[model samples]
Target chain A: LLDPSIFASLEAKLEEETQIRDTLSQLIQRLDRAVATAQGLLSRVHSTPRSRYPQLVSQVEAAVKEEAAIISELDTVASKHPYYKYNQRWTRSMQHAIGTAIYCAWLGGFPSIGRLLTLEEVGTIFSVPTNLKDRDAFHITIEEYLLSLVDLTQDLSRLATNSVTLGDFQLPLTISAFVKDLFAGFQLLNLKNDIIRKRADSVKYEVKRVEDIVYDLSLRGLIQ
Target chain B: LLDPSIFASLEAKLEEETQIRDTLSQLIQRLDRAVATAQGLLSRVHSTPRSRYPQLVSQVEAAVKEEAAIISELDTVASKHPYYKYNQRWTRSMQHAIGTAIYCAWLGGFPAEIGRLLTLEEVGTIFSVPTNLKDRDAFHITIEEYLLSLVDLTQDLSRLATNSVTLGDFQLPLTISAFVKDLFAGFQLLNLKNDIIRKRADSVKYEVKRVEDIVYDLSLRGLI
Candidate 1:
């Protein structure tokens, strides 16, 4: 005999699950919009020259601040649930937001230039925890941070080519060194055939692309 | 400054993750193979009459026991880490294995009466793993996984209903129709989002309709 009580209990559980997902979805959508706005502001770096970077970087910083506010709201809502259960809904947006911040920091947006933002610094910037292991709550995961680094590498590779077009040859050399260091670090980890592995694999090509730009600069004597 | 030490520290964390993934992968691969073997044995149910199912069920049950052993290995390795971190790597295989067990149990493989549906707790007991663990981070089966496996079971039963008619079993279609309709009604009570579970649950309607058509055909001939 089919027990109706079995389904009745499951339905109650599922109803609560649906409510959680609905709340998370609404928050994630807001986060997505915030990330997109930050990305739009940061994309101006491709066209702006080194002299104008301070102003452009400040503009991106303001956008990042907006993203941080949304993430704070997201963290408050997301912390109430099991971290991983609804994390997938917002991870893509989180990665993009983090990538934007990483790229901004690399361009001196965080009062520094030519430096990789450590995961801890990123957590501080957003006012959220990073790489949480002690508890299951809202936090930026290591995999997400690493994937954002991969995104930053890819963005910088393109920026290297643009830097030359804007008559700034030294930027490509900096990018080449930074991306090569990242590629070396990535090689140290034995990755399986997962999303991280696939994304990390592309970092090598970004390294090569930046290296080629550096080679052209050296061949043309465009760098000191 | 782009500190090399930052990358060095992350390398250590990522290395540990790679080792965990490697261990889980090997165990899940074994589980996949075991589930496939069970599926191969259980597929014979289509052509089998009700009278001969005990022999077929026993064969599938042996295969399931092998799957349970592999799952035990997976549980030991997976419990050391956060459950959701690497669960996606093995969840598909786990779903298939659970679906096989559910199907086999429905066929009286667990020494229960034919058409008996096993509860989530019963399935967890058979596999010697916990089900739907809350307030703990351990290797446990999830309610979503169990519900998804039921969707898989309905699909399989739909096929069995069609094949039952081919085997000159008029009563099996009626039994399948009643069982799947009850399942379909249970699924309708849940407010599902556009997730893997919801998408699969949508297919249950078609399975219900298929079984109903078979029953209608049997009734047309007064075979019921």
Candidate 2:
């Protein structure tokens, strides 16, 4: 049997990585659509914000870089911890898992960064305590944990822009699963929170638009 | 079972990584010892040249870091290559093997390098190539006759190290089987090389000096 503490800690970390991965999914999808729309004849063909505005391109590029870096770190975490790896896969989009935590916290104006650490760094930081002390010491080192979150997020951003083909990345697969399950929960929210569905519609429209662009990009890159 | 060109190439690479790995091995072992020594004195410490050195610790530490970084790349290379992994344990010590190539090329020069490069680099670099490229590409591109030398060398290094450990990592083990093997080998070498060992007295003196230092150091470290 797995240790209760390890299982619980991994469960929490998985939730966190998935949230960030999902956010990156949304970003990738939207960036594709946005690129196409900017080039559309209805809009100025050369007026794409990133290409023409420069600052916009840099921002998006920076965002993508940050996401890729975080994703890399999370990949390590999943690799090192079986509970994190399997559960993280189930959560979908390690980037979005973190994003969800951050997004929720962002809405409430709280910087929620207590989760999202790689297992090794966590292992290294809490080594003596982990080996000699019990597992609860993992929950005690908030600064190291926060640094790990930032590290994972940065890795995710880095994965967004690349020339080399990445074969083992989970960001794309995980996010799709998360979005599907998230809406599935809405099946039970028909009446109690139906008004929130109005906001959901706008998000869904944006998502659909982004998916179309992502499909085009994937085809162009021969990634599919 | 093997293509002629591929076999030739494999022979060359095994020779290369072996030399490089031996050099790097010497450096890393020093680093490992120094760091352990420092920790023994200092309670809690991270690896650093300043911390690890008794004399030129910093110079040795820098070399270790540089070699480790390169070796990490070599590790990634060996892991990613199909030829090496498919060959199984022949390439398990591949990083050390590649390090052996580089170190030999750097210290022993080009004739030593061409022996290993074609097997490792997989590039058509032999019309001429970088000394370092020769150093780095200890990869066995495919399983062929060339692999025999690599296979043999890897077997020798591991066997010697294992033999050395059983008889001495750098402690002499009290196992009887190894002691018998050591005796047989010593007798066999005496039979083959004794007539050619013109400076037997000098060789004996050097051997005695090394053993004396080993004894003194072990005593100083409180191991004796």
Candidate 3:
């Protein structure tokens, strides 16, 4: 005969997994649309930087705010279920949303959104209590945030190309330094996910793209 | 007071996972070259048929043989590790290699039946690597990979079917149609995960429909 408590615990875990999946399914749908909107805005971030920048930033801000509401619902779901376990299901979508928010702030000439939503702030948004000692408290994973950071670099990689066209030499230099730091941070992680590992590989290409631009700019004596 | 056996077992598994990763890294490097060779061979499959088919098929055979050798080294590692768990490391590489092989097989005129299905066991034997045990046996491609390879086949078949018409081979389209539909039926039986397999599975229908339209065009004129 099976031990009653063990069997019951296993059943509860399964039920919570199902519930988390159901909650995530709805969030994923909203995220799917939001990601499209974010990407759409990102595509225009460089193409129209002067007059159109404010409108694009506002649009992405609205999308990011909407995503926060989605995460709030997800918070309730995580509270009833285990937060850390439920997190893996929504990490990819969250990355795109967060990256959008961060990149939008950067493009709109706002302060550093990365510092604004750093680990402690993200944990607060997800309702992770300050007194909580457990690593399993509901919070954004560093990996997902880093992944989004990687996404931000890719967006900037494209921007680096267009920066020259827009007569902006200094922007690519900053991007080159920032992406190199990001790539160095990724090299420290013991990444296990294939998707994430493959993505981490692409980070090198992004770093190289920006670095190449920086190199070309230096060759032209564009920077001192 | 606790027995240390559990710690030893867990440590052993970690070692195996590490070893499998190391082996798979090498396998994927070889697979990259094989996939590149396969792509080069696949590009020629359409341009040269019947007269030059032998040379193209031979090149594919060489690539497939290289894949088998890589898979053999993979088998030695997999015998000590779980195949599916370690498979994630090289899934993308394997898919490209398998897709190229299947496409080449079709161009080389292997009938789309059990004879050409290329089972995991068949893949092992191609490199003279035998399955030593029943469950914990040596490496074999997952059925998911096999099904994915078939999905990859439809894309090439669709491309070839159209090109066949342009080349005035009316009967080739009908054969490809029957083959793809039968493959479609086989695919329907599996409950694929919502991963790359499922996403790529979506494209299968478009290719199937493309070939169906080709078949329909000929049938309307009684040319099929």
Q: Judged by TM-score, which candidate is best?
A: 1
Q: List-wise, what DockQ does each model earn?
A: 0.19, 0.01, 0.01
Compute the TM-score of each model's chain A versus the native chain A and list the values: 0.93, 0.25, 0.74
Instruction: Give the distance in Å from residue B134's predicted Cα in candidate 2 to where it truly belongs.
Output: 22
- CAPRI rating of model 1: incorrect
What lDDT does candidate 3 reach at residue A189? 54
* Clashes per candidate, residues 3 or more apart or on different chains: 0, 66, 0
RMSD of each: 5.6, 25.9, 16.8
Scanning candidate 3 chain A in windows of ten residues, the lowest lDDT window is A1-10
Better of 2 and 3 by TM-score: 3
Q: How high is the DockQ of candidate 3? A: 0.01
For model 1, the superposed segments whose C-alpha errors exceed 4 Å read A1-73, A88-116, A133-135, A141-224, B40-62, B109-113, B134-136, B155-173, B187-192, B195-224
- In TM-score terms, candidate 3 sits at 0.44
User: Evaluated with lDDT, which candidate comes out highest?
Assistant: 1
- Per-residue lDDT tens digits for candidate 2, residues A105-200, read 211212111122232323332221211111111121222222223333233223322211233223333333333333343232332223444533
lDDT of 1 at B28: 82
Per residue, candidate 3 scores C-alpha lDDT tens digits across A133-185 of 23334456555656777788888889888987887888888788778876775
lDDT of 1 by residue, A12-43 (tens): 76788888888888888888888888888877
